[PDB]
Amino acid sequence: AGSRARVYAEVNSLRSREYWDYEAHVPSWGNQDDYQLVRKLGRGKYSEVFEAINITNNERVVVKILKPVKKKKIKREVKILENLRGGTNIIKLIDTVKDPVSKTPALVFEYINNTDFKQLYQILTDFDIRFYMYELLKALDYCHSKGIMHRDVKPHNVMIDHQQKKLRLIDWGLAEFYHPAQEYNVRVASRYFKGPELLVDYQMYDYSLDMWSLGCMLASMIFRREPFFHGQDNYDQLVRIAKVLGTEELYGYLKKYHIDLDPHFNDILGQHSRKRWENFIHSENRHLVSPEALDLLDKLLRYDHQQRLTAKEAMEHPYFYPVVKEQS
Ligand SMILES: OCCCn1nnc2c(Br)c(Br)c(Br)c(Br)c21
Ligand SMILES: NCCc1ccc(Cl)c(Cl)c1
Ligand SMILES: NCCc1ccc(Cl)c(Cl)c1
Ligand SMILES: [Cl-]
Ligand SMILES: [Cl-]
Ligand code: NA
Ligand code: NA
Numbered sequence: 001a002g003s004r005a006r007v008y009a010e011v012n013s014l015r016s017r018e019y020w021d022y023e024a025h026v027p028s029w030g031n032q033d034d035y036q037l038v039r040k041l042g043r044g045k046y047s048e049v050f051e052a053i054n055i056t057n058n059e060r061v062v063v064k065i066l067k068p069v070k071k072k073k074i075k076r077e078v079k080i081l082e083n084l085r086g087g088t089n090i091i092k093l094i095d096t097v098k099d100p101v102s103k104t105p106a107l108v109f110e111y112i113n114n115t116d117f118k119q120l121y122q123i124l125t126d127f128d129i130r131f132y133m134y135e136l137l138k139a140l141d142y143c144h145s146k147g148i149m150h151r152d153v154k155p156h157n158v159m160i161d162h163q164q165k166k167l168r169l170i171d172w173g174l175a176e177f178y179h180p181a182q183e184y185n186v187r188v189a190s191r192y193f194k195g196p197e198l199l200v201d202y203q204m205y206d207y208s209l210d211m212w213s214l215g216c217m218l219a220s221m222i223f224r225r226e227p228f229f230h231g232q233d234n235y236d237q238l239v240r241i242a243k244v245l246g247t248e249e250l251y252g253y254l255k256k257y258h259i260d261l262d263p264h265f266n267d268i269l270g271q272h273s274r275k276r277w278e279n280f281i282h283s284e285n286r287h288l289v290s291p292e293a294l295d296l297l298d299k300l301l302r303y304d305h306q307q308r309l310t311a312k313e314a315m316e317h318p319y320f321y322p323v324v325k326e327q328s
Contacts, residue, residue, distance in 0.1 A: 002257060004180045005206035007310045012147040012177055020147065020177045022079035023072055032097040032106055035063055046073070046173055051111070061094060062109040073173070074105060080175050081107070083146055089139035091159070091168040109170075115162035126288050127322060129221045132160060132167055133214075134315060134323045139169040140214065141311035144207040150175050151188040153213035155226075178206055189213060191237055192227035196250070196303050199238040202259050208305040211314070215300030222288045222297070223280045239268050245303060246274030253303035292319040 012020045034056050041049045041062065052063045066074055081093040092110040099106075117124070124132075136158055143150055150157075152174040159168045174188050183203035189195070195212035197205045219228040229244070231237025242250050247269055254261055277294045296319045299309045309317070 001181060002204040003206070003306060004204075005178060005208065006306060007312070008144050008147060008178065008207065009180050011145070012179055015147070019083060020179075022076045022177070025075045025079040027075070027078050027096045027105075029098040029105060030095050032063075032099050035061065035097070035108065037063065044173075046070075052108075054108075060111040062111055064107040064109065066105050066107065068104045077173050077175070078107070080148055080172050080177075084143060084148065084172075087139065087142040087146065089135050089167050089169060090142060091170045091172075110168075112159040112166060112168050113161045113163070114159045117160075117162075120162075124221065124288075126290070129218075129288060130320055130323050131165075132158075133218060133221070134320050135167040136169065136214065136217075137311050137315045139167075140207075140210055141315065143169075143175070144178075144210070144311055147177055148175050149178055149205075149207050150210050152190065152193075153210050153217070154190045154193045155217060155220075158217075191231055191234060192216065192229055194234070194237060195305065196238060196241055196253070197305050199234055199241075200254065200259050200261055202257060205305060207310070208308045211300055211308045211311065212305070214311075214314070215297060215308070218293075218297055218300060219280075222285065222293050224285045224288070225280070235262075235264060235268060238265065239270070242269055243272045244275050245301065247272045249274055250303055256304065290319070292317070295319070 018024065034054055035052045036055050037050045037052050039051045041051055043049070047064050047066050050063045050065070052061050053059070054061055068074070078096055084090045085093070091112070093107060094110060095108040097106050097108060098104060140150065140153070150169065150172065152171060153169075157169065157171045159170055160166070176184060181204065184205055186198040186201055186203060189198060189209070193213040193216050195205070195209045197209065216228050220226040229237060229240040231240045250269070253259070277298060281289050296309075296314065296317045300314065302308050
C-alpha cells in the first residue's frame with residue numbers, strides 16, 4: 001500500500017495463474033543441432049550471443065546460449081518471451097532449444113541487422129528520433145499491457161536496422177511480472193538508466209521504471225549527451241540526477257513515499273536548483289530540440305514514478321504527431 005502502477009495494475013491477477021507463474025512453466029526444448037553458429041555477437045554474465053543459420057531452411061537467426069545454472073531465471077525469460085509473442089517491436093523468440101547431449105539451453109531469435117549509430121552516413125534527424133522513440137514506446141506499452149516490466153531499457157537493448165527502419169527491444173533476462181504491492185530487487189537496469197527509485201532502494205516500483213530509462217534515452221538523443229546522466233557509481237548516479245532535477249525536489253519525493261535515504265548520500269548530494277531543460281540546448285543540438293520535445297522529456301524525467309507519463313500517454317504526446325500523421 002505504498003505505491004502501485006497507474007495502468008495495468010491488476011492485469012496479471014485477472015489472468016490465469018499459469019500466465020505469470022513462471023516457476024511452473026515447462027518449456028518445450030527443441031534440437032539445437034539444426035543451427036550452425038557463424039559469429040559471436042556478444043557476451044554477458046548469463047549468456048553469449050551468436051549469429052547463426054538454421055541449416056534446415058537457410059534462415060539467419062540469433063542464438064543466445066544460456067549459462068544453464070539458474071533454472072528459475074531461464075523459465076522466467078522463456079515464459080515472458082512466450083507471453084509477448086507477436087508483440088509490436090518485441091524481439092521474436094523463434095524457438096527454445098537444447099544441445100541434445102549436454103542439455104544446455106539456448107534461445108533462438110529473429111535476426112536484426114543492427115546499425116552502429118557511431119558510424120553513420122548521415123546521422124539522425126529530428127524526425128528519425130521521433131520515429132524510433134515512437135516505435136520503442138509501442139514495445140513498452142505492449143509489454144506493460146502484458147503485465148511485464150523490462151527493467152533493462154538502454155540503447156544497447158534497442159536494436160535498430162536503420163536501412164529497413166525496424167526496431168526491436170531485446171534482452172528480457174531482467175524482466176519481471178508486475179504484481180501490486182510486490183517488493184522487487186532494485187539491482188536491475190544499467191547504471192545510467194536506473195531510476196531514482198532504484199538508487200534510493202525503493203522496492204515497490206512498477207512499469208514506470210522503464211519510462212525513466214526511456215526518458216534518459218530521449219534526453220541523450222535530443223541533447224547529444226550520451227549517456228545523459230553519467231554516474232561514476234550508483235551513489236554518484238543519483239547526484240548526477242539531482243544536479244538536474246534539484247535536491248529539494250528529491251527530498252519531496254522521498255517524503256511522499258516515506259523513503260529512507262542511505263546516509264552516505266548526505267556527504268555527496270550537495271544543494272542543487274532544478275535546472276531548466278532549455279539550459280542543455282546549444283548549437284550542436286538545437287535542430288533536435290523543440291518545445292514539444294522538452295515538454296515530453298519534462299514529463300518522463302520526474303522523480304515521482306507515479307507522475308511520469310505511461311508509455312501510452314507518451315505515445316499520445318504532441319511530439320509524436322508528425323510520426324502518427326506520416327504513418328497514416
Ligand atoms: O534477447 C537477448 C539478445 C542478445 N543480443 N545481443 N546482441 C544481439 C544482437 Br546484435 C541482435 Br541483432 C539480436 Br536479434 C540479439 Br537477440 C542480441
Ligand atoms: N544485452 C544485450 C546487448 C547486446 C549484445 C549483442 C548485440 Cl549484437 C546487441 Cl545488438 C546487443
Ligand atoms: N541501438 C539503437 C539505440 C537507439 C538509438 C536512437 C533511438 Cl531514437 C532509439 Cl529509440 C534507440
Ligand atoms: Cl525482483
Ligand atoms: Cl548536468
Ligand atoms: Na517481432
Ligand atoms: Na544505495
